[PDB]
Design a protein around this nucleic acid. Structure first.
Lengths: 216, 109, 51, 19, 112
RNA sequence: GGGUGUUACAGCCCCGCCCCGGCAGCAGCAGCUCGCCGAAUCCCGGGGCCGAGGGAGCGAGACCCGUGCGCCGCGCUCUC
RNA sequence: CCGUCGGGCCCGGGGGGCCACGCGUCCAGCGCACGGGGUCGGCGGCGAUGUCGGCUACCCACCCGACCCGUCUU
RNA sequence: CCCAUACCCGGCCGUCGCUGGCAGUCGGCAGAGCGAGAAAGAGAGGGACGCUACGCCGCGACGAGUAGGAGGGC
């Protein structure tokens, strides 16, 4: 019995510990600790009693089967993956959607979701975009920001809250969460001159405009 | 309600002087005229958009007459502005000198 | 067996050269030590250019 | 210690080191 | 001399060649060195039981170099990334053939 | 512009004594005045192409029949 | 006698790192993973009379290549 | 900076080599191993596939060709 103490040595580099395996021995107090070394179920029946067996043999065999495959190690299912992020895309940046039906719109980033998709939400009263997921790949991170460090984003919204169901109707659940978050961002974007006018615009490329030549 | 791609001319295939390898396309994007300017465009998804006679189903739309060939920018070519692209189908030769789009969405910004 | 590069792939190297662990456990504490000592001398020079 | 045929008696001292 | 480009290798130059391109001639079969029990199985009669031993025998030419060096398959280096100067003439007269004494380490970094 | 000559109201170069005068610093983010390198070398990011192979076993073992994340290899926690 | 970030498990004597850990006598299980070759226990669209797919096999177009075979003959 | 059928890496076909491996499918007459750097002993007082052995399987290396020779043609 004992509370599990967190790992002593911090990760210096991925794969390499900060302390050697000798200093580790002198660190866990290992010097003073030398440890010296179903299926049958009986059920009565109205006679006698019969002994049922769990998981009886299959009743069908295919004419041939595929062999079991070898075992790899590094492969993890998607839910266990590590979710990266561009360092420029901090909470408060203004993004630009590039692929969806809301392309060209200067949408406002709030937070990261557990699936790596960005919870981006331009003010619906400005950009006509709701609380929306968006893959961070298809997004240009502009160098403009707003301090949304005091905004209270709900907790019940998650990668299951924006998951498609299966004629799309706006639930009242959406509308209450919409105006709740817009009631906190809309004061914080009108604190900057022309900022609400900026988001109402749509991004486009004119003649002589080269994306590599310009910078965001 | 605006353009969301950069203009790019399909110059030719990756050729030698007496052999051409049609699984690679040389792209000339407007404005970029040096290798150091191509760093922005590496990996960007490109598209040769044409239109034909019969109708084709459209992702998120009605059957139009336009069709595309999707590709991507692989690596910078030459010493000034050109770049190599690789498409899912080797580009038809009747697209030489025609406008193909390079988008922005696989962006590293 | 798919040959992996011991220079790129760390634990392939440690399967062959187990001393490379402490070789690389050092030369990082040392580099984070000389980078520390460099910064202090660069900081102490700005105190000599004022007085 | 790293010899099979004539290091058996040697590395029995380590086996008690875990004990 | 017109066909080779030789020189004197560096300590790092040996490490990269044995690790990245090291293949042992085990039973007349080119086999990669992904495990030390492939060396110690064949070179164990010369106290070489690891790769650092095998490098120590090659780099510091010892009295078991011959069995050690014949154990390694000839290195299949790649084409020189960066381009040669001139394949034909001697290194002294601008070319690349001949004894480029210490500069052979630069050639390895690109070909390896 | 020319003449003169020795710092003059500019500078340049050489010798010795000045602790190799002293002080930074150092093959220099004055990101380029000129080298060769890494057991005296490590970190990090991006782009491109590929994923061939498919019964590797673990443990109760004779006091028991389970489980298929398993060899090598690195070190994590607990039995303080 | 001087020199050496010398060599001798840096000979012996008066803050940082060590694949160093039993007494005595003589001269073991759980998990993480740069680990014996890819997986997802991740998703999205369009689909009944005009659309979907058909490398190839029919026609046409284009870029690149490409002189007519058999034979005797250096 | 450009590219050869050259070199490196990866896939697939075939040939060649290892005169390679497999009769061990040894199951309540059972007890699941012989990848192990080191001349020799796990010695006795209910359970997928397979192995047309002229079959199946694993490693390496290699591949131009007239005259000509041989082999295989479900």
């Amino acid at each position: 019995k004992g509370k599990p103490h967190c790992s002593r040595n911090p990760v210096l580099v991925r794969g390499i510990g900060r302390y050697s395996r000798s200093a580790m021995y002198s660190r866990k107090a290992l010097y003073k600790r030398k440890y010296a070394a179903l299926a049958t179920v009986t059920k009565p029946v109205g006679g006698g009693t019969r002994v049922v067996k769990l998981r009886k043999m299959p009743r069908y065999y295919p004419t041939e089967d595929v062999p079991r495959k070898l075992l790899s190690h590094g492969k993890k299912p998607f839910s266990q993956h590590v979710r990266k992020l561009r360092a420029s895309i901090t909470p408060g940046t203004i993004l630009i959607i590039l692929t969806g039906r809301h392309r060209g719109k200067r949408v406002v980033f709030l937070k990261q979701l557990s699936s790596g998709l960005l919870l981006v939400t331009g003010p619906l009263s400005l950009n006509r975009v709701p609380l929306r997921r968006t893959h961070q790949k298809f997004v240009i991170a502009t160098s403009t920001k707003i301090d949304i460090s005091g905004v209270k984003i709900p907790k019940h919204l998650t990668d299951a809250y924006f998951k498609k169901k299966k004629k799309y109707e706006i639930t009242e659940q959406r509308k209450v969460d919409q105006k709740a978050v817009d009631s906190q961002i809309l004061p914080k974007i009108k604190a900057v001159p022309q900022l609400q006018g900026y988001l109402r615009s749509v991004f486009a490329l004119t003649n002589g405009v080269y994306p590599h030549k310009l910078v965001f | 309600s605006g353009r969301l791609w950069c203009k790019a001319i399909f110059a030719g295939y990756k050729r030698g002087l007496r052999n051409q390898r049609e699984h690679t396309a040389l792209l000339k994007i407007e404005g970029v005229y040096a290798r150091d300017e191509t760093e922005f465009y590496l990996g960007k998804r490109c598209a040769y958009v044409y239109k034909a006679k019969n109708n084709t189903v459209t992702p998120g739309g009605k059957p139009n007459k336009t069709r595309v060939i999707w590709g991507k920018v692989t690596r910078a070519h030459g010493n000034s502005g050109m770049v190599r692209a690789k498409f899912r189908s080797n580009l038809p030769a009747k697209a030489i000198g025609h406008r193909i789009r390079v988008m922005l969405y696989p962006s590293r910004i | 067996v798919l040959k992996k590069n011991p220079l790129k792939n760390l634990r392939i190297m440690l399967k062959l050269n187990p001393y490379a662990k402490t070789m690389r456990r050092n030369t990082i504490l040392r580099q984070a030590r000389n980078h520390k000592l460099r910064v202090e001398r660069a900081a102490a020079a700005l105190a000599a250019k004022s007085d | 210690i790293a010899h099979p045929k004539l290091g058996r008696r040697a590395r029995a001292r380590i086996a008690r080191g875990l004990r | 001399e017109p066909y080779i480009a030789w020189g004197y290798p560096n300590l790092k130059s040996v490490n990269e060649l044995i690790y990245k391109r090291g293949y042992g001639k085990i039973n007349k079969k080119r086999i990669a060195l992904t495990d030390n029990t492939l060396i110690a199985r064949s070179l164990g009669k010369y106290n070489i039981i690891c790769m650092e031993d095998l490098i120590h025998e090659i780099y510091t030419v010892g009295k078991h170099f011959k069995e050690a060096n014949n154990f390694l398959w000839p290195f299949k280096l790649s084409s020189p990334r960066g381009g040669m100067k001139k394949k034909t003439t001697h290194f002294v007269e601008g070319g690349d053939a001949g004894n480029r004494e210490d500069q052979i380490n630069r050639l390895i970094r690109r070909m390896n």
